[PDB]
A paper describes a structure:
To obtain doubly and singly loaded E1–Ub(T)–E2 complexes with and without Ub(A) in the same sample, E1–Ub(T)–E2 was incubated with substoichiometric Ub (approximately 0.8 equivalents) and excess ATP•Mg2+. Samples were vitrified and analysed using cryo-EM for doubly and singly loaded complexes to obtain reconstructions at overall resolutions of 2.5 and 2.8 Å, respectively. Densities for E1 and E2 active site thiols and Ub(T) Gly76 are apparent and consistent with covalent linkage at a single dithioacetal carbon. The cyanomethyl group of the linker, which replaces the negatively charged oxygen of the tetrahedral transthiolation intermediate, is positioned next to the N-terminal end of helix 18 of E1 that includes the E1 active site cysteine. Positive electrostatic potential of the helix dipole or hydrogen bonding may stabilize the negative electrostatic potential of the oxyanion intermediate. Although the local resolution for Ub is lower, it is sufficient to position Ub to reveal a conformational continuum with Ub(T) moving from a position next to the first catalytic cysteine half-domain (FCCH) of E1 to a position adjacent to the E2. The C terminus of Ub is covalently linked to the E1 and E2 active site cysteines, whereas the body of Ub(T) transits between donor and acceptor conformations through a 180° rotation and 35 Å translation as measured from the Ub N-terminus. We speculated that remodelling of E1 and E2 active site residues could impart directionality during transthiolation, but amino acids and side-chain conformations around the transthiolation active site remain relatively constant throughout conformational changes for Ub(T). Doubly loaded complexes represent those that are most adept at Ub(T) transfer. Doubly loaded E1 bound to Ub(A) and ATP•Mg2+ is most adept at Ub(T) transfer to E2 but prior biochemical studies have shown that ATP•Mg2+ alone or the Ub(A)-AMP adenylate can also enhance Ub(T) transfer from E1~Ub(T)20.
Numbering used by the authors:
A (entry chain A): 14 to 765, 780 to 1012
B (entry chain B): 1 to 76
C (entry chain C): 2 to 148
Write the structure that this text describes.
Amino acid sequence: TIDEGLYSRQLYVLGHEAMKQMSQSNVLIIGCKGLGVEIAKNVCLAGVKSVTLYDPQPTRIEDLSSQYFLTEDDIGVPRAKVTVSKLAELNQYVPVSVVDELSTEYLKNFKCVVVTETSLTKQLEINDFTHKNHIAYIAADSRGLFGSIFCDFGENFICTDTDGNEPLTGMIASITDDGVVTMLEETRHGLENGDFVKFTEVKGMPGLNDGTPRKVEVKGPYTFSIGSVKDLGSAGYNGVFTQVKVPTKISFKSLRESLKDPEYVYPDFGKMMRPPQYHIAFQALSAFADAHEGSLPRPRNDIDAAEFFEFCKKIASTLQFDVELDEKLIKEISYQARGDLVAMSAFLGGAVAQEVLKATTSKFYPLKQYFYFDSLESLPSSVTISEETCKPRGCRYDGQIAVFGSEFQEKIASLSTFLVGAGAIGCEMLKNWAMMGVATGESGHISVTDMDSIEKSNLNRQFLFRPRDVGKLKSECASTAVSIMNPSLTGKITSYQERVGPESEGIFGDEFFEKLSLVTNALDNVEARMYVDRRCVFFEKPLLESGTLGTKGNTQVVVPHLTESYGSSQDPPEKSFPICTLKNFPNRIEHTIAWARDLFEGLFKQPIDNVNMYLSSPNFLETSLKTSSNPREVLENIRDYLVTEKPLSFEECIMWARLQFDKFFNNNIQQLLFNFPKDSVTSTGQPFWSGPKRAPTPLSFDIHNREHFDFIVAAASLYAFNYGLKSETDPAIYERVLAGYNPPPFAPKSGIANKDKQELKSIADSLPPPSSLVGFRLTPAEFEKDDDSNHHIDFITAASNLRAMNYDITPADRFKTKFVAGKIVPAMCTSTAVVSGLVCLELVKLVDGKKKIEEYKNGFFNLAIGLFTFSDPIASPKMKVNGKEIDKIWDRYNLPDCTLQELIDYFQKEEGLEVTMLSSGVSLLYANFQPPKKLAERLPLKISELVEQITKKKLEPFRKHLVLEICCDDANGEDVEVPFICIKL
Amino acid sequence: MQIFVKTLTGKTITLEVESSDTIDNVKSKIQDKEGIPPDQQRLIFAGKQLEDGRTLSDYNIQKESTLHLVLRLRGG
Amino acid sequence: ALKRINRELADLGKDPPSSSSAGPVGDDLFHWQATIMGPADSPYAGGVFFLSIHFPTDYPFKPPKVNFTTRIYHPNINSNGSICLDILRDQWSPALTISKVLLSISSLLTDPNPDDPLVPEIAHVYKTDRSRYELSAREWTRKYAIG
Ligand SMILES: Nc1ncnc2c1ncn2[C@@H]1O[C@H](COP(=O)(O)OP(=O)(O)OP(=O)(O)O)[C@@H](O)[C@H]1O
Ligand SMILES: [Mg+2]
Ligand SMILES: [Mg+2]
């Protein structure tokens, strides 16, 4: 009973069984500061049964540094009491409660217990109980730029899925007598040693199709081994294999046992000696707090640092830790003890919420057991950081000033950022900026642009939007929400509904970009990313890129004159199937879904567009007769949809749907089998319908069958929508109309001058004149996946399953059909939180203006396996031009609006280079091989005039520059690459 | 020398290389074992992204070293 | 994309393709019109076939869209001009030039592949009645590819 209208994107990550188990699990969260509220928000969005909060501590001003559900009117009220009301709105299916006191025996009501802001003695007391009663325990801590997570799911935790990948399947070519399985031509199985597989449709070895998993021994990218199959047969031909994923048993240790001998998860292999240091440091923090009435070391205090280091020495000696303590790092942990950063809170809260989901679902591999993280490279170095600058000022930014200082706060308050996109990452980024205090100064400003509107499925991971906001613009709602979070942002945010691209350069022009400090992308496609990257390269602005997919994510930083841009690297492209496979020889459900989408377009979109264009353009027929690749098809479509097969009622729509069923599932298959009989052989004597080619069989229409009736209903409804008729859903009318249907006879055809043009003319003049039909239009069908009442996904599912039945392919349901046809990207709130945290940790590096390239980190992670990795950005390549060092990316030529001849002469005299090609946009302004007359015509013209003449379009008034690409050769004739030219108009 | 490559999806790959091999040879081996073109491979060792034209000894990659094969994602 | 396209164009200009001639339409670098000459030892001998090439914005990281404009009676070319060529759908790499694609198309014209066809009826005629296929191909190349 999962509401798929809300959990659409999350179900593609977790699944129905996982969410069913989640909806029966109780989560207790101790602590309601930034980390705790982040965890609780992510858990409420995920969809657990309920959440209970325990935090009786009264609110303080500094708590607002990362707690975005607290306002300055809540000072002196317990944090849980003021947080529960705002948490109860995130998800209506998840109640949120508060308990004023905790007893140990009360812990048995919860599936998972999360602990934050709790001393080590209390943690030991809680874990001693949860461990022996088999309750999942998670403890998280966030101290300045340092973080720690600990997980303990019990001694006998059962994990059913350990990586979150789909089971591997493949088509076999042959299985020898010794179990050597070979894949089809140039096909990789992708298995690893120790995997289990099961076989089906294996011919010659009927014993392998029972369904018993077998061990896999990988012998190469194309073959593997399963053992001895001597008894089952001598050799097997064809068939398919599917991977079997087996449960695993993970055994955890209690906190008391694991303090002495911890097991570390390493977020970075560049610093593998640190986690042992942090293990001692956090325990020393707990001891220090216990010795000072629960007070942490004061910011940048040397006396407290010395005492803390003494505690660290004592703890290290007690635990027999044979590790040499790094004094600088440990004292850094001491200095930032009272730090409370929203970026660290977001990062750790996303990770911890994913761990909670793992505990409640028994899916994905959990952290085992200690995860110590630092982002110490984010500490500013361009400002003074001392005890005087880091002391609290009694403001909401105290938790951040305790780390960065007041001067860096002044630097942050005067940022002028530009955020492209307002989705999940955009909402998280806006929240982080509001908490950090970005753009709250006199010279600060925020600009956010997004052309989309809020939908029901977006509420699952875009926590700034509520159900009342459905149908409104994303950017306006996000700006209002963050102005509520931080009132100082009132009037400092401007929201646009513009798409960023070539068509919006009049709004995001030179004046707009010249005032920015940095650009942050929150997009979901590569085209927009490339466009924004090119704009940032031209204007020399820092760019923050981030992306997510399910549980995976990455973040990249582009720094002018230091690193390469976003477009300097290539990603794997989308997979498109061969046209021959889709047209005639499918063997996967994906092929049939692509075919069904093309059928939908060809039945309800293209003919309607042709009919509408015929009734509008006065010279449509003549242009189409020599422009399109098949004017006969256009004429036939117009005739059929205007006169020949225009329905007058819904019964004619039903009859049309029946005829289309016959056309696409019975007659084309008969024609194909007439061309290639099932007994036919190739040119080499092999059978034709073998391997990837499956012999089809025609379908006979049966009204009682569910798929046939579904196809008829959906097709009739869509046809009626095209003609604006009143559709019906009662099966009685369908069964009555289809009963009296006489199929026209069909016989496959064996085949065996200039009058065709005359026939086309006769067809054209037979059409009614456009003047006779004025104000008459046919409504085309525009594909929409998120609506479950337009019959689009219903039609595609029915057509795909019918074609699968033709070729004996296993049909899919509406869920998978919508996933494949809609190109849906799986999305999670936890991954969004993690990427926003990483991006905001890089943002402070950008604000500080760090110059070295080793101080920046690009991040990659997969939360399903608990993998984190970081790497320095790649430096921009250099080159030698005229014996000078030139940056291949960030350098350009600045020239006035001179003539073409003057530009060529300048490049000859100054750079000693001969210009061979000059282009702008998508036009060739100049080439060395053009005829002399054309050149002599184009030489004495200015660059702006030349561009206007060649492109046949005048430059817009807001256009202030031109970008030219130039290819030139040296004196010896060697081609030398040069940077682009920026002509100033 | 034998090294291990871990993918962002959890797969593990074992490569037989030598300290004098260039990054191009390693990328070609990874392409042979996985089909990923060398221009689309992002290899990370000890917080450094490996670049073409250099050798393994430039990164101090010794035996039983672990590299990470990563990629960028388009959602969000 | 512009620099790569111009480099390919200049390379074509330097060494003539002999049996082919591709160039931009007007001044647009992302729209070419190529010409292919029918092989002598083929039914399409003495024929001129026009192809339209559309370079995507992501060239060379996405394949060019190549479509026949002249009608041709081939088992692997349908009535819309679509060409059943692997290097144009999923085997494309950013290391193949337009000259290589033209050579591949000429090789396809010199000998069809009816075992994995795009037009099953022409493939059936080719496999069963070869002489009728030859006559039909000659008739089509005389009717459309000449003039
Ligand atoms: N060129 C663009 N200019 C501005 N905003 C853009 C552009 N392309 C995409 N966006 C916005 O970027 C955001 C992408 O985030 P996200 O993918 O999570 O949202 P969505 O596309 O609405 O949701 P879903 O893909 O899950 O159905 C969306 O708001 C989308 O409107
Ligand atoms: Mg949307
Ligand atoms: Mg999207």
